[PDB]
Ligand binder design. Structure first.
Ligand code: HEM
Lengths: 100, 100
Protein backbone atom coordinates (compact mmCIF):
# COMPACT_ATOMS: atom_id res chain seq x y z
CA UNK A 1 0.00 0.00 0.00
CA UNK A 2 1.79 3.09 -1.32
CA UNK A 3 0.41 5.70 1.09
CA UNK A 4 1.24 3.54 4.13
CA UNK A 5 4.79 3.04 2.85
CA UNK A 6 5.09 6.82 2.54
CA UNK A 7 3.78 7.17 6.10
CA UNK A 8 6.38 4.68 7.27
CA UNK A 9 9.19 6.42 5.38
CA UNK A 10 8.18 9.80 6.81
CA UNK A 11 8.25 8.47 10.38
CA UNK A 12 11.67 6.90 9.87
CA UNK A 13 13.12 10.05 8.28
CA UNK A 14 11.83 12.25 11.07
CA UNK A 15 13.30 9.93 13.68
CA UNK A 16 16.67 10.11 11.93
CA UNK A 17 16.58 13.91 12.15
CA UNK A 18 15.44 13.68 15.76
CA UNK A 19 18.83 12.08 16.48
CA UNK A 20 20.61 15.04 14.88
CA UNK A 21 20.77 17.18 11.76
CA UNK A 22 21.78 15.16 8.73
CA UNK A 23 22.18 15.09 4.97
CA UNK A 24 20.54 12.85 2.39
CA UNK A 25 23.41 10.40 1.90
CA UNK A 26 24.05 10.15 5.63
CA UNK A 27 20.37 9.48 6.24
CA UNK A 28 20.26 6.72 3.64
CA UNK A 29 23.30 5.06 5.23
CA UNK A 30 21.82 5.22 8.74
CA UNK A 31 18.48 3.80 7.62
CA UNK A 32 20.21 1.02 5.67
CA UNK A 33 22.15 0.01 8.79
CA UNK A 34 19.20 0.32 11.18
CA UNK A 35 17.12 -1.90 8.87
CA UNK A 36 19.91 -4.49 8.47
CA UNK A 37 20.01 -3.66 4.76
CA UNK A 38 16.29 -4.23 4.15
CA UNK A 39 15.51 -0.55 3.57
CA UNK A 40 17.69 1.13 0.94
CA UNK A 41 16.07 4.49 0.38
CA UNK A 42 16.60 6.37 -2.88
CA UNK A 43 18.03 9.91 -3.02
CA UNK A 44 15.08 11.07 -5.13
CA UNK A 45 12.56 9.62 -2.67
CA UNK A 46 14.14 11.68 0.12
CA UNK A 47 14.10 14.84 -1.99
CA UNK A 48 10.41 14.35 -2.66
CA UNK A 49 9.63 13.84 1.02
CA UNK A 50 11.86 16.66 2.21
CA UNK A 51 10.30 19.16 -0.21
CA UNK A 52 6.93 18.48 1.42
CA UNK A 53 8.30 18.56 4.97
CA UNK A 54 10.07 21.87 4.31
CA UNK A 55 6.94 23.33 2.69
CA UNK A 56 5.02 22.35 5.83
CA UNK A 57 7.62 23.88 8.16
CA UNK A 58 8.45 20.52 9.75
CA UNK A 59 12.12 20.64 8.73
CA UNK A 60 14.45 23.30 7.41
CA UNK A 61 17.64 23.07 5.39
CA UNK A 62 21.04 24.73 5.50
CA UNK A 63 24.43 24.29 3.87
CA UNK A 64 27.31 22.50 5.52
CA UNK A 65 30.92 23.75 5.48
CA UNK A 66 31.36 19.78 -2.29
CA UNK A 67 28.99 21.24 0.30
CA UNK A 68 26.14 19.12 1.64
CA UNK A 69 22.56 20.21 2.23
CA UNK A 70 21.72 19.50 5.87
CA UNK A 71 18.23 19.14 7.28
CA UNK A 72 17.01 19.86 10.81
CA UNK A 73 13.73 19.31 12.59
CA UNK A 74 12.13 22.66 13.38
CA UNK A 75 10.58 23.57 16.72
CA UNK A 76 7.19 22.83 15.13
CA UNK A 77 8.50 19.56 13.72
CA UNK A 78 9.70 18.47 17.16
CA UNK A 79 6.35 19.33 18.73
CA UNK A 80 4.41 17.50 16.00
CA UNK A 81 6.55 14.39 16.47
CA UNK A 82 6.00 14.36 20.24
CA UNK A 83 2.24 14.79 19.84
CA UNK A 84 2.15 11.98 17.26
CA UNK A 85 4.25 9.70 19.46
CA UNK A 86 2.03 10.29 22.48
CA UNK A 87 -1.24 9.73 20.60
CA UNK A 88 -0.06 6.61 18.79
CA UNK A 89 1.19 5.33 22.15
CA UNK A 90 -2.35 5.74 23.49
CA UNK A 91 -3.56 3.77 20.46
CA UNK A 92 -1.13 0.97 21.30
CA UNK A 93 -2.44 0.78 24.86
CA UNK A 94 -6.03 0.77 23.58
CA UNK A 95 -5.23 -2.18 21.31
CA UNK A 96 -3.48 -3.94 24.20
CA UNK A 97 -6.69 -3.60 26.21
CA UNK A 98 -8.79 -4.94 23.32
CA UNK A 99 -6.80 -8.19 23.23
CA UNK A 100 -6.27 -9.19 26.87
CA UNK B 1 -3.97 16.45 12.64
CA UNK B 2 -7.23 15.18 11.13
CA UNK B 3 -5.84 12.55 8.74
CA UNK B 4 -3.67 11.00 11.48
CA UNK B 5 -6.67 10.82 13.81
CA UNK B 6 -8.56 9.02 11.05
CA UNK B 7 -5.62 6.65 10.64
CA UNK B 8 -5.67 5.98 14.37
CA UNK B 9 -9.44 5.43 14.42
CA UNK B 10 -9.21 3.01 11.48
CA UNK B 11 -6.53 0.94 13.22
CA UNK B 12 -8.54 0.77 16.43
CA UNK B 13 -11.76 -0.19 14.62
CA UNK B 14 -10.03 -2.94 12.67
CA UNK B 15 -8.50 -4.33 15.84
CA UNK B 16 -11.93 -4.42 17.46
CA UNK B 17 -13.25 -6.48 14.54
CA UNK B 18 -10.15 -8.68 14.69
CA UNK B 19 -11.37 -9.76 18.14
CA UNK B 20 -14.75 -10.75 16.68
CA UNK B 21 -17.63 -9.52 14.56
CA UNK B 22 -19.39 -6.58 16.16
CA UNK B 23 -21.95 -3.83 15.75
CA UNK B 24 -21.54 -0.07 15.96
CA UNK B 25 -22.82 0.42 19.51
CA UNK B 26 -20.86 -2.56 20.80
CA UNK B 27 -17.71 -1.23 19.15
CA UNK B 28 -18.15 2.20 20.70
CA UNK B 29 -18.57 0.63 24.14
CA UNK B 30 -15.46 -1.54 23.77
CA UNK B 31 -13.33 1.36 22.59
CA UNK B 32 -14.60 3.58 25.41
CA UNK B 33 -13.59 0.94 27.96
CA UNK B 34 -10.24 0.13 26.36
CA UNK B 35 -9.36 3.85 26.33
CA UNK B 36 -10.48 4.36 29.96
CA UNK B 37 -13.16 6.74 28.69
CA UNK B 38 -10.79 8.97 26.71
CA UNK B 39 -12.08 7.85 23.31
CA UNK B 40 -15.85 8.14 22.88
CA UNK B 41 -16.44 7.50 19.20
CA UNK B 42 -19.55 8.82 17.48
CA UNK B 43 -22.02 6.55 15.64
CA UNK B 44 -21.78 8.74 12.53
CA UNK B 45 -17.97 8.60 12.54
CA UNK B 46 -18.14 4.80 12.48
CA UNK B 47 -20.67 4.81 9.63
CA UNK B 48 -18.37 7.04 7.60
CA UNK B 49 -15.38 4.80 8.21
CA UNK B 50 -17.28 1.57 7.65
CA UNK B 51 -18.70 2.77 4.33
CA UNK B 52 -15.13 3.21 3.07
CA UNK B 53 -13.90 -0.10 4.52
CA UNK B 54 -16.83 -1.98 2.97
CA UNK B 55 -16.28 -0.24 -0.38
CA UNK B 56 -12.65 -1.37 -0.23
CA UNK B 57 -13.58 -4.97 0.64
CA UNK B 58 -11.84 -4.80 4.02
CA UNK B 59 -15.00 -5.53 6.00
CA UNK B 60 -18.45 -6.81 5.16
CA UNK B 61 -21.78 -6.42 6.93
CA UNK B 62 -24.68 -8.70 7.78
CA UNK B 63 -27.81 -8.57 9.90
CA UNK B 64 -28.04 -10.06 13.36
CA UNK B 65 -31.01 -12.10 14.63
CA UNK B 66 -34.53 -4.32 16.46
CA UNK B 67 -31.90 -6.10 14.38
CA UNK B 68 -28.29 -4.91 14.48
CA UNK B 69 -25.93 -4.50 11.55
CA UNK B 70 -22.84 -6.58 12.26
CA UNK B 71 -19.45 -6.09 10.65
CA UNK B 72 -16.73 -8.67 10.01
CA UNK B 73 -13.19 -8.45 8.74
CA UNK B 74 -12.94 -10.12 5.34
CA UNK B 75 -10.19 -12.52 4.32
CA UNK B 76 -8.57 -9.59 2.49
CA UNK B 77 -9.04 -7.36 5.53
CA UNK B 78 -7.29 -9.91 7.76
CA UNK B 79 -4.39 -10.22 5.32
CA UNK B 80 -4.03 -6.43 5.00
CA UNK B 81 -3.96 -6.06 8.79
CA UNK B 82 -1.25 -8.70 9.19
CA UNK B 83 0.89 -7.13 6.47
CA UNK B 84 0.47 -3.69 8.07
CA UNK B 85 1.31 -5.03 11.52
CA UNK B 86 4.45 -6.76 10.26
CA UNK B 87 5.73 -3.75 8.32
CA UNK B 88 5.05 -1.24 11.09
CA UNK B 89 6.78 -3.65 13.47
CA UNK B 90 9.85 -3.48 11.23
CA UNK B 91 9.59 0.32 11.41
CA UNK B 92 9.57 0.14 15.21
CA UNK B 93 12.73 -1.96 15.22
CA UNK B 94 14.37 0.44 12.76
CA UNK B 95 13.60 3.36 15.09
CA UNK B 96 14.89 1.36 18.05
CA UNK B 97 18.19 0.92 16.19
CA UNK B 98 18.36 4.64 15.37
CA UNK B 99 18.24 5.58 19.07
CA UNK B 100 20.52 3.10 20.84
C1 HEM C 1 5.37 5.38 16.18
C2 HEM C 1 4.45 6.30 15.90
C3 HEM C 1 3.56 6.18 14.74
C4 HEM C 1 3.30 7.15 13.82
C5 HEM C 1 3.87 8.55 13.80
C6 HEM C 1 2.38 6.61 12.88
C7 HEM C 1 1.91 7.36 11.80
C8 HEM C 1 1.10 6.82 10.83
C9 HEM C 1 0.64 7.53 9.70
C10 HEM C 1 0.95 8.98 9.41
C11 HEM C 1 -0.13 6.68 8.97
C12 HEM C 1 -0.85 6.96 7.66
C13 HEM C 1 -1.97 7.99 7.80
C14 HEM C 1 -1.56 9.27 7.12
O1 HEM C 1 -0.46 9.34 6.52
O2 HEM C 1 -2.31 10.27 7.16
C15 HEM C 1 -0.13 5.43 9.64
C16 HEM C 1 -0.80 4.32 9.19
C17 HEM C 1 -0.89 3.17 9.96
N1 HEM C 1 -0.32 2.91 11.15
FE1 HEM C 1 0.77 4.08 12.13
N2 HEM C 1 2.08 5.34 13.20
C18 HEM C 1 2.76 5.00 14.32
C19 HEM C 1 2.76 3.80 15.02
C20 HEM C 1 1.95 2.73 14.69
C21 HEM C 1 1.82 1.55 15.44
C22 HEM C 1 2.54 1.25 16.74
C23 HEM C 1 0.93 0.73 14.78
C24 HEM C 1 0.51 -0.62 15.23
C25 HEM C 1 -0.78 -0.95 15.31
C26 HEM C 1 0.51 1.43 13.61
C27 HEM C 1 -0.37 0.95 12.66
C28 HEM C 1 -0.70 1.67 11.51
C29 HEM C 1 -1.55 1.08 10.47
C30 HEM C 1 -2.17 -0.29 10.49
C31 HEM C 1 -1.68 2.01 9.51
C32 HEM C 1 -2.46 1.89 8.22
C33 HEM C 1 -3.68 2.82 8.21
C34 HEM C 1 -4.46 2.63 6.93
O3 HEM C 1 -4.02 1.89 6.02
O4 HEM C 1 -5.56 3.21 6.79
N3 HEM C 1 1.17 2.63 13.58
N4 HEM C 1 0.64 5.53 10.78
Amino acid sequence: PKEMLRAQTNVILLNVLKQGDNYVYGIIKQVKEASNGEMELNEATLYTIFKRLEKDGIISSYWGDGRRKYYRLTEIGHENMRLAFESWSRVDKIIENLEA
